[PDB]
């Protein structure tokens, strides 16, 4: 969770906040960005700091998403964004992708 005062002071210094509940998503983000999940609020050292080509808030259809995007044609994790007119159709496409 994010404290109100912490959110205030982060907004004051122009810092983007993302709150991932699931530890799996945090681990995958660490893999795909190259950062290390620090256990304290200490400022990150140079090696532990992650890097990405672009991070932004975007809307696809009617769902708001947060995108971590690499301009290079490489990376540890790549994602496939599946569109469709039905949930069942997208599930079948996901099975085909698997």
């Amino acid at each position: 969770k994010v404290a109100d005062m912490a959110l205030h002071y982060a907004n004051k210094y122009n810092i983007m906040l993302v709150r991932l509940n699931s530890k799996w998503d945090l681990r995958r983000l660490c893999k795909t960005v190259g950062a290390t999940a620090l256990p304290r609020l200490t400022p990150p050292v140079l090696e532990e700091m992650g890097h990405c080509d672009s991070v932004y808030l975007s809307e696809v259809g009617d769902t708001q998403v947060v995108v971590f995007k690499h301009e290079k044609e490489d990376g540890a994790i790549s994602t496939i964004v599946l569109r469709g007119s039905t949930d069942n159709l997208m599930d079948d496409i996901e099975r085909a992708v698997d």
Binding site: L7, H8, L57, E59, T63, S85, T86
Partner: protein
């Protein structure tokens, strides 16, 4: 069937296989479609669905009606899902998708009955849909001038067309102008949460207003609030996230004293903490104070003594809208209330709105948000007005992203049907029947428009087909004149993406329904 001593699946597992289940699925899709047919076009009607608790809902939107229907047929649920998809991606055309998909299925039903292989039908649908989408992209009219007045007129006409099927269609020009004005204030993302929609009971539809700022209901003022002035001519607004009350310093704070002097000092320290927060707020220069957290009676009386306005428990989205309109910052701490974190509006006022008290922030020149105040005689009346305005807002947003339009009223459907028939005449013949069936199914929209309007559908369709064949692209149904007319010159304009997504979703749903050969339903746990 021979009863095996130990059966394969569980007791009560029901399985339907073969052509009969496909025909039953098509019939179920038809049944779902006919529940929304009459809600199509300017002469469409509304449906009244009552839930289990007796809270009725009235709507003209196909997606809403389908959602309120407790559809349990597995094949029929695909139509509801594609209606939801069309509402999410576009926001308009939630009825056309269902009618088009059901008409596709109905047209191919006779061939299914005679043992035609469903993969052939699926391939034919894919080919026809690809061709139709390409034709829509090719023939869509675009304005390559980037003119302000022309683009605004395009937005207003698109909003008018999207609105001329609802109960606010009589005031459609007024509401379309308001919707276009509201949308043009959004900065770059056109987020829906930046367009507030307040519904206040009582009043005519023409009494609805759009405020160039932010407005919200009064939120449980404490004692001493009535001595605060209710009008400011150049206020500075202190947007805060602070609880201005006498309370425990923390939930785990314990005070240990052993002297009465220390007791008095502790009480005075609590009072001094509260008064220090209040004095910092007052010395910030602000006149209007808003907080997400509650503001106590002591703070209310303090601000009344200083001729200031306060309001606690303001909803978070309303504070975001006020921040965007005035240009401040939601401060969780009052230690640094500099001039750059304070909102500013020309006029703040609290007025009576139909039996309720609303706070009005107007005159914001840099506002990136707006608030709709909808008036009506009933809760469902205002809810349907809100749904109609949402449809118009989504249409205007999509038009803002790209200004490609096609004439409505079935003109595009006739053009696509003619093109698909012309293509089908030039193929070997097994795909020919299916592509012709697709083209014929494309004729459902103007036929349903004529049926809803009480015309003679056959004569209108014959005239439209003749006009399209002999030359003319944007000829559709003219409801008022009981005849056909050039719908492009009649300003029946809709974005091309509406029809594109409608055709794509209908084709995908039809292919998914056709591809199924067996349905197995396990017993409920």
């Amino acid at each position: 069937m021979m009863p095996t001593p130990v059966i394969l699946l569980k007791e009560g597992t029901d399985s339907s296989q073969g052509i009969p289940q496909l025909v039953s699925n098509i019939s179920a899709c038809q049944v779902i479609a006919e529940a929304v047919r009459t809600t199509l076009g300017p002469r469409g009607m509304d449906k009244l669905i009552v839930d289990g608790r007796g809270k009725a809902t009235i709507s003209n939107d196909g997606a809403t009606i389908l959602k309120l229907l407790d559809v349990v047929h597995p094949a029929a649920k695909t139509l509801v899902d594609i209606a939801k998809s069309q509402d999410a991606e576009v926001g308009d055309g939630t009825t056309s998708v269902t009618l088009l998909a059901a008409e596709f299925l109905k047209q191919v039903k006779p061939y299914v009955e005679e043992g035609l292989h469903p993969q052939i039908i699926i391939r034919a649908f894919r080919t026809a849909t690809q061709l139709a989408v390409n034709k829509i992209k090719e023939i869509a009219v675009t304005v390559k001038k980037a003119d302000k007045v022309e683009q605004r007129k395009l937005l207003e006409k698109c909003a008018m067309t999207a609105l001329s099927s609802k109960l606010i269609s009589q005031q459609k020009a007024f509401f379309a102008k308001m919707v276009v004005d509201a949308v043009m204030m959004l900065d770059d993302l056109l987020q829906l949460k930046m367009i507030g929609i307040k519904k206040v009971q009582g009043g005519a539809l023409e009494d609805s207003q759009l405020v160039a700022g932010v407005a919200f209901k009064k939120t449980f003022s404490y004692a001493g609030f009535e001595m605060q002035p209710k009008k400011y001519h150049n206020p500075k607004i202190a947007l805060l996230n602070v609880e201005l009350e006498l309370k425990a310093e923390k939930d785990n704070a314990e005070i240990r004293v052993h002297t009465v002097e220390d007791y008095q000092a502790i009480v005075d320290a609590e009072w001094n903490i509260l008064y220090d927060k209040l004095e910092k707020i007052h010395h910030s220069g602000a006149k209007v104070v808003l907080s997400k957290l509650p503001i106590g009676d002591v703070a209310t009386q303090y601000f009344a003594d200083r001729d200031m306005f306060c309001a606690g428990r303001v909803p978070e989205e309303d504070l975001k809208r006020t921040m965007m309109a005035c240009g401040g910052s939601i401060q969780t701490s009052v230690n640094a209330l500099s001039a750059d974190v304070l909102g500013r509006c020309q006029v703040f006022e609290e007025t009576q709105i139909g039996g309720e008290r609303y706070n009005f922030f107007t005159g914001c020149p840099k506002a990136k948000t707006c608030t709709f105040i909808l008036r009506g005689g009933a809760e469902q009346f205002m809810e349907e007005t809100e749904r109609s305005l949402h449809d118009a807002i989504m249409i205007v947003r999509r038009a803002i992203k790209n200004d490609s339009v096609v004439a409505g009223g079935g003109a595009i459907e006739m053009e696509l049907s003619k093109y698909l028939r012309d293509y089908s005449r030039t193929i070997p013949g097994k795909q020919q029947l299916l592509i012709g069936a697709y083209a014929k199914a494309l004729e459902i929209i103007p036929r349903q428009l004529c049926d809803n309007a009480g015309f003679d559908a056959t004569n209108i369709l014959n005239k439209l087909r003749a006009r399209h064949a002999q030359g003319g692209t944007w000829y559709g149904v003219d409801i008022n004149n009981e005849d056909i007319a050039d719908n492009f010159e009649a300003f029946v304009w809709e974005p091309a993406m509406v029809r594109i997504n409608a055709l794509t979703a209908a084709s995908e749903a039809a292919c998914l329904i056709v591809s199924v050969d067996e349905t197995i339903k396990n017993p409920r746990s």
